[PDB]
Design a protein around this ligand. Structure first.
Ligand SMILES: [Mg+2]
Ligand SMILES: [Mg+2]
Ligand SMILES: [Mg+2]
Ligand SMILES: [Mg+2]
Ligand SMILES: [Zn+2]
Ligand SMILES: [Zn+2]
Lengths: 548, 343, 549, 342
DNA sequence: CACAGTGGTAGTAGGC
DNA sequence: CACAGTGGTAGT
DNA sequence: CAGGATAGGGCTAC
DNA sequence: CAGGATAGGGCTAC
DNA sequence: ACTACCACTGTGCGGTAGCCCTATCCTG
DNA sequence: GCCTACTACCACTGTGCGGTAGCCCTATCCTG
């Protein structure tokens, strides 16, 4: 009684309740109270239909090229007709995806109430059919350690790829200005990164990745050139779509944007700069790169219309030896920028402990000893344990002034102490900017002073840390220093557009694969995708914020 | 016949199914690497140097005027003559099909480090389509060499291609495209004998005839035991091409074809059907207008092979067959490799 | 028309709902329905107080030696006063434990309902204060991959130790019969392996392990010498306790029973036999190893009264070079027996793929190729993915005549096919016995013919697997073949007495550390122990089983 | 003085805090190994062999007449004159405390296979309660000899030991048990100067006397800077014992005591506080009836050391100190080790 | 500047 | 013969 | 005997 | 120059 | 609305690729 | 006075990321 199936489903998914555990609870309640407080599993499963893609009727004007107009399409095989024939490429991957059309439609209709609330909050007629520009944060991340299951099905890798999408900013054109009828308040929330494709593949396996995603990219390109008429709130509203591919880590960006690996002399996914030039200039780089430029550049690399060597050709294309697969935005993964910059600060601490500014060469095991010193101390003072690979929470408890104080305790030279403290002061005057979901509203003068603090960071890097940044520089330092202001004035934020959300979604993918999915290869991805779509349903989340 | 497990530890991960070996004056060359070309070998073409039955992929380089072609997996590879390899179609690692042709000549040989000229060839006239699993093989009619391109798999035409079935392949309209290379032209021929689209069919051109063997037709999902013989006669004017469905054809798909002796090829491996791979190597002894598909002594197939659901490979070129089988654990041991030297 | 706090707690726990998730659900149901259907968190904690140790007044009429008579202690520090002074041995360990007497009291008063129900089912007045012998399966296990947490606290290892106990059977002595008023139907269930000590240490770290458990072991030894007057159903019932430490993996048994590691010439935690003698006799071995005998043997080792060399001394004490600190039962971990036996059959399959019965001199790489062949095939046929370390599920899918039928497709000798099929037929006629919770009920004909089937299995290892079993034999093969009949005559079951419960509870330890515990070194073990106790509370499992009753 | 970072191999895991080194042979032997003696070294005793700053713990063996004593942590280790080593107490790896005394002699040296007659001396009389952190030390008065066992943590008595504080240790009643190894007879002595039970103290045994030095009183949790001098006289009667708290003591605990030169010792490391370990070494020069605790030059402690909360060690016997510090803890290496020679 | 928890106090709002 | 799920689907 | 591969480590991202 | 360590692999358990 | 079935899960359990540049090594 | 309900606070989580320990027997390798 008094509990609708949609509310019961919200309770189930948002509480991470499995259908099995929810059934336990529902039958226990039905037996103890007698009343059927919670709705049965079948009622939840029927409510899901409303929230899952393939329920709401929509159309695209113009109709999407190469995309089924069939609105009955929910979860489909991400393989997308990919022949598992022995004669064909041995696709070893369980891929289940929503059709990007249907996914956007369900994500909007799920925010139907939110969109109406925001266009009412923006002093507009909530019956406006005007074209809503829906800025969508495309997000893809490989997971790894995704233990494959016994049973029928391919010999999938113990790796996953989660192409998600966060509807970040719905703005309608109310005459002259683009009034923002909705902004994802927590853009990097796992509650908002709508899953779109879960494939049990490796992002480093470009062939499989592409076979699985090129349907999604084709839908994405179709939607870019189209307008989604969708019956929201009884009115047919038109939604233009701006897909900003930003939740891709630099490794994946390079994979999909045709670029060489991050170790490549060509250091950015944004500028055509060499790691050396980036260590020399360090702050003054425009955003040169783009999916279109990278496509032209792979076409150049392939056709070699200037009959150049591989080296000078590579320079002509600036590392684009592969064909850009995805139209990612030349942006920064704030999450992985924090990760990489904190790992570089961590190595910097290792070195300062080694006085490498005084001792250019040093034993590899002596460097391990410095790392162990830093580990023991960070555990002593900053209480944060040693981790194999840098994570964000470590990068946050480490990119801290008390952390650099603790490290300084390990350095005898107070000159290096001040070098490090200044480096961190600048990095933390800068980090709000590329972590803020809206630095103009969370760190305005930390952004206005970003060019200056980045110039000073670069000075300190090429002067006080030149033992580490002579002819070399981390790609994420280059991004942090050179491109952040451009990305702010372009996108408005960087943290909002991070892979953070899709990585939290990796957490929930693990949780759902272990606790909210049929533990069979044939159905793990379908069920995880269903449940992770429901988890991200702003509708169910509304029901779960009913206490407010 | 002579099976020997090959060893490779570095660059092994690049050997994917659909890879295409090219024999250049005995020097075998890998192509169709997994993924896009890494800066180790930005070309994707490697020296396929098997020493002591250990395989080394040595990064090869290209000419200056070369077109750094994509790693094409399951393309149509032939030897035009110069001795340049024609490469049509194939799956770009973005699972895109290449409408381009890539004539990989050898431009310079030094250190035994060969430089290639992977000249892009565009197909004027009746460009076949972006396809893969097809065949290209040069016929020689009246001293005119002409590629015969018989269909393989292609993605559904962009009109019928849907993203829910994006990677859905259809065997191309079974046509015989006469790829002229001195004219860069292609000419399709609708042969009534070829009305069931084929792909992954071994093709053997001797002088002027192309024996299309085996294959797989998605319109049927069968591997028809067909032995189409596409005899090409090239008068100076419009060409002529006549197919004749000869008997004795074998039902094999994805098979590998190595020329052991002149006019004596070996169709080893492939697939008789999905869960049954052709573990019987066949001999194909040819003549001016004849062909005999014998059944060679089935090699001492390793258990790893006999039980390998999937198995791929390519003709090293002399008489040998590089043959890979998934041996993955989930890992630079995904594909256990073997060399089958015949005669 | 709301729910009671105890039943809402049962829901929260058995549904694995965190208190945060439960609060979301509760506030959502309260704001949607407008009425308080679920009881808020504070009510759930007040309920937990009842189900957690340190609530029900109890009294050991022989006062427990070295145990506080205080019946209020719940989640105490497992360190148990272990001096974390910098001068002392570094306590790199977070241990939270219940006092074993308090824990047993809470476990009983939790199954109070079940005890009385079974006394009634036995037509026994549910007011009988007769001495209930509570046969408890105290189960310890180590679990690695326990991700250490940032934050203040000792630099604990990424390894945990769950000392659990499972009330296995409560039998009241009704004068002339030892009727069982309760018997854990699913003894290896995670709903019954009650957590007693969550240590964030390694079981291989004997120093810390002992510092943390010797209090539990002292409570156990005291309760072995005392009757527990506990007021249930309004009557002061008295419970005698028979502790049976069977839920120990042989590694841990040997660690805590003073024995050399599993790899050893001395092969069984039960008999004082050598791996050679065990590969020769292979069945006829009597259970000799007791905690008391192992103590006497460590005293002989330490004392070396007969002035014997280390070799003859070690063969006098039969591998007891360490001192036992846990009184485990001479028993077989059916879980790890199945796992080790399936690992050995996996190796057998490898070697038959390699025809090591013909070519016993392979080179480290055709062996790997045979392992890979087996991997590929079991994945193709048995749908078994290649796992790094044999798990029980891979084991029970691999120990099937289906798996042998598949593997034989890799052996070009139908003679070896027959050998493997006979071996597995025997192993599967034997496994029900040391896996069943009551073979005399689940597989009596297999237990009757277990001696014969094991003799046949042993002569099949001696004849057709002379390789891999000439002078060598796995410890768990020896246990399966030699001791199982005696362990059944002694304990009535082996699988009931397995670590499978505490292991399965490792899954819940992980789940609760991630999702039902404060993510702080100072609180993770306390919270996991609390919630994993509640999970194992039959009082709550009843509410979750009210759909039936 | 000479701090030399030491590498250990294949047995680093056995070197645990509370380990004891015994200098027979001039070659040092490691006794208290982590966990119980693995069949690699069923005896627990090891050939402690520092060679080129590398530590090779070569499994030693015991005689036939020997007692395979447990790996005792923080026992009372003394050399005794044969050149035996007394080992009283210590935490048996089961966290039990040994009451037995273990007299490790040496026999049958094969140039690689030194063997020990680890006799078990049992005590009759005022036997010292099972304890650890104490300090047995041999005095030689009137040509006779006795072992001055003093202090040490012990578990609460079974009359008062509760399982909730099972491992809670009380500093043993401050008593100087004269232990006659000549007969294995322990004679306890109540000395008013020793009001606080000490543990993890240094104990420097010159002739006729034992300088107790800088322990840790647990009742107070304080490390008193006391320098109790237990002057032991053996005039063939009731063995007299007069303690004397001397001015000059140092607030240390768990400190390592080496005898660099005769009548001269070095107190290395230990702890001044749980907050701060002791980085200053202390030269303790002894005259037949006096003691002077100088302050050596603080060795150039590696930042590994300076910033390690915990640090343990033992006198190898050549004036050098084998001291370990917690290393990078998953299984990188439990401890880093150093041979600080003097 | 990720964010949604993680649970148990502590404290603060209401009811009487 | 572990067992408590894992979610949908079919079947009462 | 300097040039052209190879191995391996540092470094970039994951 | 056969005996006494060492390394390493097989094997036992995890 | 239950409930089974399904074929499986986790608990058993402790860094990677790529780029590049340099140091080896390996020539004819 | 209570008792109940809500909420902040704490200080961190995971998602970012891909076989050990022992015994013991044998092959190495000293070894004066
Ligand atoms: Mg990732
Ligand atoms: Mg990634
Ligand atoms: Mg264990
Ligand atoms: Mg374990
Ligand atoms: Zn850039
Ligand atoms: Zn036995």
């Amino acid at each position: 009684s008094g509990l609708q199936p949609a509310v019961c489903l919200a309770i189930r998914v948002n509480t991470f309740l499995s259908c099995s555990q929810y059934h336990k609870m529902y039958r226990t309640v039905k037996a103890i109270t007698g009343r059927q407080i919670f709705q049965p599993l079948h009622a939840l499963r029927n409510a899901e239909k409303v929230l899952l893609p393939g329920y709401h009727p929509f159309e695209w004007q113009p109709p999407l090229k190469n995309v089924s107009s069939r609105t009955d399409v929910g979860i489909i095989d991400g393989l997308s007709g990919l022949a598992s024939s022995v004669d064909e490429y041995p696709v070893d991957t369980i891929a289940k995806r929503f059709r990007y059309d249907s996914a956007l439609v369900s994500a909007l209709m799920d925010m139907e109430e939110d969109i109406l609330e925001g266009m009412r909050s923006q002093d507009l007629d909530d019956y406006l059919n005007g074209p809503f520009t829906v800025v969508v944060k495309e997000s893809c991340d490989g997971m790894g350690d995704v233990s494959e299951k016994h049973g029928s099905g391919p010999a999938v890798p113990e790796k996953a790829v989660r192409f998600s999408f966060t509807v970040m900013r719905i703005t309608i054109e109310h005459g002259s200005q683009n009034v923002k009828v909705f902004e994802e308040p927590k853009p990097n929330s796992v509650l908002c990164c709508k899953p779109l494709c879960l494939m049990l593949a490796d992002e480093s396996d470009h062939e499989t990745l592409t076979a699985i995603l090129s349907p999604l990219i084709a839908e994405r390109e179709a939607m870019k050139s189209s307008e989604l008429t969708l019956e929201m709130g009884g009115i047919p509203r038109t939604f233009k779509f701006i897909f900003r591919g930003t939740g891709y880590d630099e490794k994946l960006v390079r994979e999909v944007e045709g670029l060489e690996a991050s170790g490549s002399v060509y250091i950015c996914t944004l500028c055509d700069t060499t790691r050396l030039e980036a260590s020399q200039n360090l702050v003054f780089h425009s955003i040169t790169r783009s999916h279109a430029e990278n496509l032209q550049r792979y076409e150049v690399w392939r056709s070699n219309p200037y009959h150049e060597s591989v080296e000078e050709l590579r320079d002509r294309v600036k590392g684009v030896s592969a064909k850009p697969f995805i139209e990612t935005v030349p942006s920064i993964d704030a999450l992985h920028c924090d990760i990489g910059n904190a790992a570089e600060f961590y190595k910097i601490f290792q070195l300062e402990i080694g006085e490498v500014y005084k001792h250019p060469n040093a034993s590899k095991e002596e460097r391990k000893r410095w790392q162990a010193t830093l580990d023991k101390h960070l555990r002593k003072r900053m209480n944060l344990k040693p981790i194999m690979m840098m994570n964000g929470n470590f990068a946050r408890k480490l990119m801290t002034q008390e952390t650099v104080d603790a490290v300084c305790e390990l350095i005898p030279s107070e000159e290096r102490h001040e070098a490090l403290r200044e480096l961190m002061d600048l990095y933390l005057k800068m980090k709000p900017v590329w972590r803020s979901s809206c630095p103009a509203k969370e760190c305005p003068e930390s952004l206005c002073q970003y060019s200056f603090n980045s110039q000073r960071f670069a000075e300190l890097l090429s002067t006080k840390f030149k033992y580490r940044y002579e002819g070399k520089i981390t790609n994420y330092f280059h991004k942090t220093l050179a491109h952040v202001p451009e990305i702010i004035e372009r996108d408005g934020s960087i943290g909002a557009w991070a892979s953070e959300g899709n990585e939290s979604g990796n957490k929930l993918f693990r949780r759902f694969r272990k606790m909210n999915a049929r533990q069979s290869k044939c159905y793990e991805m379908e069920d995880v995708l269903k449940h992770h779509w429901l988890y991200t349903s702003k509708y169910l989340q509304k029901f779960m914020n009913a206490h407010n | 016949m002579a099976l020997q497990m090959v060893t490779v530890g570095h660059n092994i991960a690049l050997i994917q199914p659909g890879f295409s070996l090219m024999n250049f004056d005995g020097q075998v060359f890998f192509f169709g690497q997994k993924g896009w070309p890494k800066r180790s070998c930005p070309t994707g073409v490697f020296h396929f140097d098997i020493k002591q039955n250990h395989l080394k992929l040595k990064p090869a380089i290209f000419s200056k005027d070369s077109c750094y072609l994509p790693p094409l997996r399951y393309p149509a590879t032939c030897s035009y003559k110069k001795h340049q390899y024609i490469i049509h179609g194939g799956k770009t690692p973005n699972n895109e099909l290449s409408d381009k042709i890539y004539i990989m000549s050898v431009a310079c040989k030094n250190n035994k480090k060969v430089t290639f000229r992977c000249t892009e060839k565009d197909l004027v006239g009746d460009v076949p389509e972006p396809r893969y699993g097809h065949s290209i093989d040069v016929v020689y009619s009246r001293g005119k060499s002409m590629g015969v391109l018989f269909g393989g798999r292609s993605y559904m035409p962009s009109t019928q291609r849907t993203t829910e079935k994006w990677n859905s392949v259809a065997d191309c309209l079974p046509h015989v495209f006469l790829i002229d290379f001195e004219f860069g032209c292609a000419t399709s021929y609708i042969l009534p004998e070829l009305q069931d689209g084929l792909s992954f069919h071994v093709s053997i051109a001797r002088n002027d005839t192309v024996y299309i063997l085996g294959g797989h037709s998605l319109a049927s999902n069968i591997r028809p035991a067909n032995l189409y013989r596409i005899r090409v006669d090239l008068p100076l004017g419009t060409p002529a091409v006549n197919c004749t469905v000869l008997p004795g054809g074998i039902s094999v798909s994805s098979a590998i074809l190595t020329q052991t002796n002149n006019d004596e090829f070996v169709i080893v491996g492939g697939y008789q059907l999905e869960n049954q791979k052709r573990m019987v190597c066949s001999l194909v002894s040819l003549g001016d207008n004849t062909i005999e598909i014998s059944e060679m002594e089935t090699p001492d197939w390793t258990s790893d092979i006999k039980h390998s659901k999937i198995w791929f490979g390519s003709n090293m070129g002399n008489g040998t067959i590089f043959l890979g089988i998934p041996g993955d654990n989930k890992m630079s041991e995904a594909f256990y490799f073997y060399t089958l030297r015949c005669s």
